[PDB]
Amino acid sequence: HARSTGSYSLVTQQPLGGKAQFGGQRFGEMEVWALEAYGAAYTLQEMLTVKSDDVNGRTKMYKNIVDGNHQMEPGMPESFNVLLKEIRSLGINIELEDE
Amino acid sequence: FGASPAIVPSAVIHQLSVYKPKDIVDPATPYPGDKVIITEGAFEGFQAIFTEPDGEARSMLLLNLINKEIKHSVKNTEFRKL
Amino acid sequence: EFDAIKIALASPDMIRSWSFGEVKKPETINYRTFKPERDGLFCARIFGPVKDYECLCGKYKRLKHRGVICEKCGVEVTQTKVRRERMGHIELASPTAHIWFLKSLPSRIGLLLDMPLRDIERVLYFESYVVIEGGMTNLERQQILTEEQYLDALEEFGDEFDAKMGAEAIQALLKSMDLEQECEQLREELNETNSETKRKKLTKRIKLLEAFVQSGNKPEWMILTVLPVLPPDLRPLVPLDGGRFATSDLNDLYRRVINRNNRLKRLLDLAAPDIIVRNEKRMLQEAVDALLDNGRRGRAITGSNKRPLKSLADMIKGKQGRFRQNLLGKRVDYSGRSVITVGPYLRLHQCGLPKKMALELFKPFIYGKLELRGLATTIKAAKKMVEREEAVVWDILDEVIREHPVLLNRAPTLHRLGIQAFEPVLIEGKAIQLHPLVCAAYNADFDGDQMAVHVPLTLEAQLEARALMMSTNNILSPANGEPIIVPSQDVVLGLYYMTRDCVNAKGEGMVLTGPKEAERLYRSGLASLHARVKVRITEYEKDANGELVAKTSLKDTTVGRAILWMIVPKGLPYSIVNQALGKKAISKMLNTCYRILGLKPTVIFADQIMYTGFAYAARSGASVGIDDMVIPEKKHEIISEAEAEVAEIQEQFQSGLVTAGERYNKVIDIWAAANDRVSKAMMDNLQTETVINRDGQEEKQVSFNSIYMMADSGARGSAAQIRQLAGMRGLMAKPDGSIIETPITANFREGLNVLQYFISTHGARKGLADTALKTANSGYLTRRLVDVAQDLVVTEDDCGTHEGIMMTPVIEGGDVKEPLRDRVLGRVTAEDVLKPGTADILVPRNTLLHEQWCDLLEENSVDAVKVRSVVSCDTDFGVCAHCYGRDLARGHIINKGEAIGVIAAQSIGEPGTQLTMRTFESSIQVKNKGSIKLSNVKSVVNSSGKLVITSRNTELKLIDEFGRTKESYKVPYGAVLAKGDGEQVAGGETVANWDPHTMPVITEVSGFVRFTDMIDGQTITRQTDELTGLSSLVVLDSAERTAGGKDLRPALKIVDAQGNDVLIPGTDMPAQYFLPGKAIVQLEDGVQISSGDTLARIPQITGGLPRVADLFEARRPKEPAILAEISGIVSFGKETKGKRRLVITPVDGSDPYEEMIPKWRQLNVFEGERVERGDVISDGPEAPHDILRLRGVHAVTRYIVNEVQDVYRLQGVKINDKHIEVIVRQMLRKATIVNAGSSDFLEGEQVEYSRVKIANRELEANGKVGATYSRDLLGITKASLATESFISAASFQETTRVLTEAAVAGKRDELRGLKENVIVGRLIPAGTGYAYHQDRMRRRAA
Amino acid sequence: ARVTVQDAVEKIGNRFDLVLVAARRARQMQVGGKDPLVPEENDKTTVIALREIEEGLINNQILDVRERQEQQEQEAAELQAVT
DNA sequence: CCACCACGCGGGCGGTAGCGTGCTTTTTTCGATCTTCC
DNA sequence: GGAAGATCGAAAAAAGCACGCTACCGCCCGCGTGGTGG
RNA sequence: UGGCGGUAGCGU
Ligand SMILES: [Mg+2]
Ligand SMILES: [Zn+2]
Ligand SMILES: [Zn+2]
């Protein structure tokens, strides 16, 4: 099973799962721990946002790679926004303090 | 309320026995001269005034055009209450 | 863009401000036309348009109308993505309490209102009236009244008091209180009160009130009045391609809430009776509670097919929640999965990759290169060319992956070695080809294993994977520093066969001019590979200045070793390959090559070793045949004699001479001895039974048997496996765990009958079940360990601390488990190392101890070294590089920014699979020759001149002639000594003896013994002996002691010829040896005794993964050993009824220590002894909290490290102490105040240790006196949960409680950590990104 | 090609800023249209930057010096063009 | 005139009752002594 | 000598129970009520 | 081409 780009989930904006669905391999918690053990920061960040959830990041990455430029825009993962919306729906305020 | 079933006092029963009300009932309020929203037909999403029940199948409203409102009777299922 | 996250409860007004509309109908989507209804759960007007830049009515359907709303239907023409952000709101008819703030223990509402949770539960669901206005009547403010009580109060008082129901009454009570006066009164009461539990309750209530008043939140906001509604896209109705839609549980719960609210509004509009209104309000409250968190109270709402519904809180917590399923880990693009095979031709930094799989993975790169080359002008043309698979596409594929590393990962990623960077090589096939050497790193077997591949797609990731995670850069295990890339199965066997000498091999005795001639002779088939010859070879030695000098000489060796000498680099000497070269020999050679030559030649040497081993193992053609396992000729004689002995023992037992247990033990021992003899005979017949005819006569040499060659070389198997091959299988254990009388006397070469196979299946089944049910425990333990130390990174260089651990080699019994060398290597010293007896600076204060320093210190016979430890690192919010030590994976000191905590957690958790969960002396022996030292000893001479100790913690050390402590033992109190201190003794001699069954009372004075202060039948009894019949006194306990004799405590007084009690020499009061319970005294009245005589007789698994979990979680031993809090004498107070009261009376200080001790618990100390701080008073394990409180941080750290190391060594796994020290430091992160001082911390507050240290330092700099703190040992789960960053605690587990705490307290979370940065999606503060973060920090300086 | 980067690591001396400086050089070469100071043999930008770092031609301090000199040259040129 | 294609308000399901039921660890509460005094 | 703090064991409630991957099955409100076609 | 619940299997 191999995937470069394809359909994404309609709720979490993440790649699908399973060979029959042409999904992508899951990067579990232990993989993240191993990456942090190596000191992997840029690789982990590019595996977390610009590859899975950041729609604008994914489009920018695709355009840059087609154009021959290897640069990453971290953007903002949509899973965190979904979690914030769910927490807000629970009657509990959560927000990002810029200051 | 709690483990045991609730016991209603006889005063409430006495009040309910002589309870002879008159109410409008909110969701069934296509009263004459009342605001009603039509969401189907040629006048979908338009606010009009129910003014008389024409028969049973097709109640009668002052359907609102861009210029003014005109007497017209259309199906009951077309419009809901505002 | 942002710096921190603010978490708090939402006010109803601001909740309304959040919403773009109000949902008033339960309808979601009309089935006739796929459009939402007005004011529905999916209404376009409230949330947004269903299509991009398209009005719902259709009047405006172009981008030119963006930003304006329609008038036909009232929807805004914007993007569809706005439906993912806009939220709805429902106006509840009556206020409803929040389930999270009410049921999550401790109840926030109940604790705030100071009333039991049961009363809150009753009043909330319309069961008991609660008062709000106390008035002038007897009713107070908050009183619980039932319906009858409420009616009686109403009849007695009219309108003087107000009582209400439901959540409205709770809201009124919350709104009608003042926080300032309440907290002031609570503080005053806490100052005035003295009860410890009352003090703790008042302190926690004061803390809650202070946290509430500090933030802008108000108590009345805790009762919900406006209910938020999730955006529709977060609860989508996926089409079912059958005319129906799949409604999510959230939609159903929202429909229930809407229907109940509408029903309540209609009922209250009609002036319904009190009972009906109360029932409807209770139903609405139940529906709201179910929606917010289903199953918390009562019965959970069932689904369509009888399952609990998924509520809002159900998708936040748990493994399937958003935190642990879509935030910590997520599916990624540019990834693939395939099975793995073995490629022998690949290099250490190369891995095979299928052509089609690589084409699928590298599609965007191929598209870009094709566009650049001009072959295609659009994306569609490039896609068509790629799918058509032209030759130019393959050329582009080859070009784009020339030097593009890929990340290969395995599913059970235990440690960091589970994912590694490899250079891809295109192959035709369908399986990934893996390097054989890295397999041990991956723990992967080519038996169906599947591995995943990820493609980094940016310059930073590519360079960072090339430099950090490349396979060539990972040759040392971070857990212990031992090499990982080593020959495992075939290379070791091939090299062992190559470097083996025969006796009369072809071409023996010839003289060769060099390795080239030897190779050309072997290839030509003119001399055997095992022939012993003499070859002239030149070897290069590394000079001191850093140069290579070539020395040529003739060596007597074999042809195989001469051939192997080709691939050995210049620097290595020839002595490494002039042996049998087993697996450990190969590993030692590789380690030496890495140490001397470096890293660049090491990979080439490893590749050449693997190639040569594979080639010569193929050439040798070793095979296993049925004739290889030889059955000993003497086996049947041993079996027959053992059976005869067992039969004669059984027939002796039949006569009744020996009982069942003794005969069973004898049979077991006889069978074990027979099995050992058979195994030894088989090993002797297999090792060197090869007789070869040397020129002139026969000779004996090491056997060339395939099994023996394959096992001795260490390629596969071990001694036990070979014993199972040819010798008897031995005894086996039944399911309970006991040994079976009849062992399996059949080999695997021969057949086994049904009974033996059935017996043997038990162990295999037990092992398989243990592994299957142990994988989960290991995973949970490693997850907890990773979370506990996920925010510990090196962020300093040197704290200047002069405190360190007193590291010494560990001694346990008659063997040295671990010397000082391995336990100190790769660590820095806490202070100067002094040569023994010369007071000379052997090692400087802050010099890292490498191999040379280790040799220098071991040459001086030093044993005690004070070394800086992570637990003693003075740096706050991280540790320094110097206080940590060696990187343990590189030759240099650890670099700044590394994540030491994750390294430690992975290293500790990786051996979880190897562990197990199965649950199943009277003299001192001397082994070596050396002198004897005694520590913590107060000894006196006995009647015969022997030495008897009066100290309970006496330790004897057997020290060699070089002054190094060789052996250590703990001699029990009152043990006779055969020899004195400072006398050299030989092995096998006994120095001390004692009675373990019962202890005798030791007398330190000489004189007469009388029968005083005791009366027969009241305190003691003159019982006749069963056999001798002598009248011996037995002391009755307090339960059977008479009331009159309660104050008459028995006590034997040693008297002189005068008759009065003899005072202790140098001590004021006389020697009154107390008589404890069950004391047996044989001597009669007025018996003359000397010092050291015996007075009275007193009568007298936890291993594997559960032991590690208990040690880490600080679990109570369930039978703690009582320790003396303060140093002083011991006295007995009132006996009470169940527990004895012991009073500690220091000679100089006061006596505030009174301790309750259970009666059934044995007391080690008597009434008239002297004890110090942290002294054992009762038998049993020592609780870690007690050790930390009494003996300090160093002692508890040493105890935990020693226990963990012993547990791991029992299983044969070695782990460095740095990881355990890091974990222990993470354990000790909380301090509780004792004296408030000038600081604002409360007396009972428990806060972070770093904050206390910073506050104390600031106060000292200002000049004001600081506060006093005591460190607290909290379990790893509690330590992880109780952290400053609430995001990590929420992601860990117990999300409801931590989220409620954060919402109530209004906490502000700065990231300053790894897990929260990962969740947000920014660069982690560990490793490379750390540098960037540092820059950001300095940008916040100005 | 670069099988190992141990000598480059000891040249940088910390193993973490080496990744940053190599990435900066690679980004400068790939999209900035820069000319490498080390001859290339059909090699990627990343390994080319690593090989440049090998001989000490590229380092954080000298790279910053070159960046500042280029910035001052371009600002002087634009000031002359404007004036 | 009978089978079968919507449909739109409720909620545990079904029944003149009862259904549940082979884990361990941690935290909270509560009756019962107790015990200790003012 | 009765009331409040101690405590103490005994009982009750809450949370967790590894990671990836593959394949199949079943369902995607049920039910009293209503109108319409074979 | 979306989810779950159950079952079975693979690698540990
Ligand atoms: Mg396998
Ligand atoms: Zn419109
Ligand atoms: Zn330090």
mmCIF file with all atom_site columns, N, CA, C and O in Angstrom, chain C residues 879-897:
data_model
loop_
_atom_site.group_PDB
_atom_site.id
_atom_site.type_symbol
_atom_site.label_atom_id
_atom_site.label_alt_id
_atom_site.label_comp_id
_atom_site.label_asym_id
_atom_site.label_entity_id
_atom_site.label_seq_id
_atom_site.pdbx_PDB_ins_code
_atom_site.Cartn_x
_atom_site.Cartn_y
_atom_site.Cartn_z
_atom_site.occupancy
_atom_site.B_iso_or_equiv
_atom_site.pdbx_formal_charge
_atom_site.auth_seq_id
_atom_site.auth_comp_id
_atom_site.auth_asym_id
_atom_site.auth_atom_id
_atom_site.pdbx_PDB_model_num
ATOM 1  N N  . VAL C 1 879 ? 17.680 20.197 33.104 1.00 0.00 ? 879 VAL C N  1
ATOM 2  C CA . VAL C 1 879 ? 18.926 19.824 33.756 1.00 0.00 ? 879 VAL C CA 1
ATOM 3  C C  . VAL C 1 879 ? 20.089 20.316 32.907 1.00 0.00 ? 879 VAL C C  1
ATOM 4  O O  . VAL C 1 879 ? 19.933 20.659 31.734 1.00 0.00 ? 879 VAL C O  1
ATOM 5  N N  . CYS C 1 880 ? 21.265 20.360 33.522 1.00 0.00 ? 880 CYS C N  1
ATOM 6  C CA . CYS C 1 880 ? 22.469 20.785 32.828 1.00 0.00 ? 880 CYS C CA 1
ATOM 7  C C  . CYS C 1 880 ? 23.193 19.583 32.230 1.00 0.00 ? 880 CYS C C  1
ATOM 8  O O  . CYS C 1 880 ? 22.997 18.438 32.642 1.00 0.00 ? 880 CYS C O  1
ATOM 9  N N  . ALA C 1 881 ? 24.038 19.864 31.236 1.00 0.00 ? 881 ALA C N  1
ATOM 10 C CA . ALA C 1 881 ? 24.793 18.799 30.584 1.00 0.00 ? 881 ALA C CA 1
ATOM 11 C C  . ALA C 1 881 ? 25.780 18.146 31.544 1.00 0.00 ? 881 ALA C C  1
ATOM 12 O O  . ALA C 1 881 ? 25.923 16.918 31.554 1.00 0.00 ? 881 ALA C O  1
ATOM 13 N N  . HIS C 1 882 ? 26.474 18.950 32.354 1.00 0.00 ? 882 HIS C N  1
ATOM 14 C CA . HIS C 1 882 ? 27.475 18.398 33.262 1.00 0.00 ? 882 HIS C CA 1
ATOM 15 C C  . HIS C 1 882 ? 26.837 17.520 34.330 1.00 0.00 ? 882 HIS C C  1
ATOM 16 O O  . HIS C 1 882 ? 27.345 16.434 34.631 1.00 0.00 ? 882 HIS C O  1
ATOM 17 N N  . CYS C 1 883 ? 25.722 17.966 34.910 1.00 0.00 ? 883 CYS C N  1
ATOM 18 C CA . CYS C 1 883 ? 25.057 17.189 35.948 1.00 0.00 ? 883 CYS C CA 1
ATOM 19 C C  . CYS C 1 883 ? 24.424 15.911 35.412 1.00 0.00 ? 883 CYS C C  1
ATOM 20 O O  . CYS C 1 883 ? 24.037 15.051 36.212 1.00 0.00 ? 883 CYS C O  1
ATOM 21 N N  . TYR C 1 884 ? 24.310 15.763 34.093 1.00 0.00 ? 884 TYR C N  1
ATOM 22 C CA . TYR C 1 884 ? 23.754 14.552 33.497 1.00 0.00 ? 884 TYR C CA 1
ATOM 23 C C  . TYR C 1 884 ? 24.839 13.507 33.253 1.00 0.00 ? 884 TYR C C  1
ATOM 24 O O  . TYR C 1 884 ? 24.762 12.389 33.772 1.00 0.00 ? 884 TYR C O  1
ATOM 25 N N  . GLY C 1 885 ? 25.855 13.857 32.464 1.00 0.00 ? 885 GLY C N  1
ATOM 26 C CA . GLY C 1 885 ? 26.962 12.966 32.185 1.00 0.00 ? 885 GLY C CA 1
ATOM 27 C C  . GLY C 1 885 ? 27.138 12.738 30.693 1.00 0.00 ? 885 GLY C C  1
ATOM 28 O O  . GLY C 1 885 ? 26.825 13.608 29.872 1.00 0.00 ? 885 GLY C O  1
ATOM 29 N N  . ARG C 1 886 ? 27.649 11.556 30.357 1.00 0.00 ? 886 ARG C N  1
ATOM 30 C CA . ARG C 1 886 ? 27.902 11.204 28.969 1.00 0.00 ? 886 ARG C CA 1
ATOM 31 C C  . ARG C 1 886 ? 26.590 11.028 28.210 1.00 0.00 ? 886 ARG C C  1
ATOM 32 O O  . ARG C 1 886 ? 25.560 10.659 28.779 1.00 0.00 ? 886 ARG C O  1
ATOM 33 N N  . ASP C 1 887 ? 26.639 11.307 26.905 1.00 0.00 ? 887 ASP C N  1
ATOM 34 C CA . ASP C 1 887 ? 25.474 11.137 26.043 1.00 0.00 ? 887 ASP C CA 1
ATOM 35 C C  . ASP C 1 887 ? 24.998 9.688  26.023 1.00 0.00 ? 887 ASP C C  1
ATOM 36 O O  . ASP C 1 887 ? 23.805 9.441  25.815 1.00 0.00 ? 887 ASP C O  1
ATOM 37 N N  . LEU C 1 888 ? 25.901 8.733  26.252 1.00 0.00 ? 888 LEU C N  1
ATOM 38 C CA . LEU C 1 888 ? 25.668 7.290  26.268 1.00 0.00 ? 888 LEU C CA 1
ATOM 39 C C  . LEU C 1 888 ? 25.444 6.716  24.876 1.00 0.00 ? 888 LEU C C  1
ATOM 40 O O  . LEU C 1 888 ? 25.318 5.495  24.738 1.00 0.00 ? 888 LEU C O  1
ATOM 41 N N  . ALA C 1 889 ? 25.390 7.551  23.842 1.00 0.00 ? 889 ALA C N  1
ATOM 42 C CA . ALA C 1 889 ? 25.354 7.086  22.462 1.00 0.00 ? 889 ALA C CA 1
ATOM 43 C C  . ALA C 1 889 ? 26.469 7.656  21.604 1.00 0.00 ? 889 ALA C C  1
ATOM 44 O O  . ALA C 1 889 ? 26.710 7.128  20.513 1.00 0.00 ? 889 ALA C O  1
ATOM 45 N N  . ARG C 1 890 ? 27.152 8.706  22.053 1.00 0.00 ? 890 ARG C N  1
ATOM 46 C CA . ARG C 1 890 ? 28.275 9.294  21.344 1.00 0.00 ? 890 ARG C CA 1
ATOM 47 C C  . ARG C 1 890 ? 29.443 9.438  22.309 1.00 0.00 ? 890 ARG C C  1
ATOM 48 O O  . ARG C 1 890 ? 29.270 9.450  23.530 1.00 0.00 ? 890 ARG C O  1
ATOM 49 N N  . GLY C 1 891 ? 30.647 9.546  21.744 1.00 0.00 ? 891 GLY C N  1
ATOM 50 C CA . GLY C 1 891 ? 31.842 9.617  22.565 1.00 0.00 ? 891 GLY C CA 1
ATOM 51 C C  . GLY C 1 891 ? 32.002 10.915 23.327 1.00 0.00 ? 891 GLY C C  1
ATOM 52 O O  . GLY C 1 891 ? 32.781 10.966 24.284 1.00 0.00 ? 891 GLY C O  1
ATOM 53 N N  . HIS C 1 892 ? 31.286 11.962 22.931 1.00 0.00 ? 892 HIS C N  1
ATOM 54 C CA . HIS C 1 892 ? 31.402 13.268 23.558 1.00 0.00 ? 892 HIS C CA 1
ATOM 55 C C  . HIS C 1 892 ? 30.330 13.455 24.626 1.00 0.00 ? 892 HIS C C  1
ATOM 56 O O  . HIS C 1 892 ? 29.447 12.615 24.819 1.00 0.00 ? 892 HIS C O  1
ATOM 57 N N  . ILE C 1 893 ? 30.425 14.583 25.332 1.00 0.00 ? 893 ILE C N  1
ATOM 58 C CA . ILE C 1 893 ? 29.421 14.934 26.327 1.00 0.00 ? 893 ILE C CA 1
ATOM 59 C C  . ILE C 1 893 ? 28.107 15.259 25.622 1.00 0.00 ? 893 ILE C C  1
ATOM 60 O O  . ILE C 1 893 ? 28.086 15.670 24.454 1.00 0.00 ? 893 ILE C O  1
ATOM 61 N N  . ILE C 1 894 ? 26.995 15.053 26.332 1.00 0.00 ? 894 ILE C N  1
ATOM 62 C CA . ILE C 1 894 ? 25.681 15.261 25.736 1.00 0.00 ? 894 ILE C CA 1
ATOM 63 C C  . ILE C 1 894 ? 25.509 16.726 25.359 1.00 0.00 ? 894 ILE C C  1
ATOM 64 O O  . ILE C 1 894 ? 25.838 17.632 26.136 1.00 0.00 ? 894 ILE C O  1
ATOM 65 N N  . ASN C 1 895 ? 25.006 16.962 24.152 1.00 0.00 ? 895 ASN C N  1
ATOM 66 C CA . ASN C 1 895 ? 24.812 18.312 23.652 1.00 0.00 ? 895 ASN C CA 1
ATOM 67 C C  . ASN C 1 895 ? 23.540 18.925 24.230 1.00 0.00 ? 895 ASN C C  1
ATOM 68 O O  . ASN C 1 895 ? 22.617 18.225 24.656 1.00 0.00 ? 895 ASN C O  1
ATOM 69 N N  . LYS C 1 896 ? 23.503 20.253 24.239 1.00 0.00 ? 896 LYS C N  1
ATOM 70 C CA . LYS C 1 896 ? 22.346 20.970 24.750 1.00 0.00 ? 896 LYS C CA 1
ATOM 71 C C  . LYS C 1 896 ? 21.145 20.786 23.829 1.00 0.00 ? 896 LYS C C  1
ATOM 72 O O  . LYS C 1 896 ? 21.279 20.672 22.608 1.00 0.00 ? 896 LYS C O  1
ATOM 73 N N  . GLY C 1 897 ? 19.957 20.759 24.432 1.00 0.00 ? 897 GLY C N  1
ATOM 74 C CA . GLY C 1 897 ? 18.721 20.610 23.696 1.00 0.00 ? 897 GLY C CA 1
ATOM 75 C C  . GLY C 1 897 ? 18.231 19.189 23.529 1.00 0.00 ? 897 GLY C C  1
ATOM 76 O O  . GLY C 1 897 ? 17.114 18.992 23.033 1.00 0.00 ? 897 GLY C O  1
#
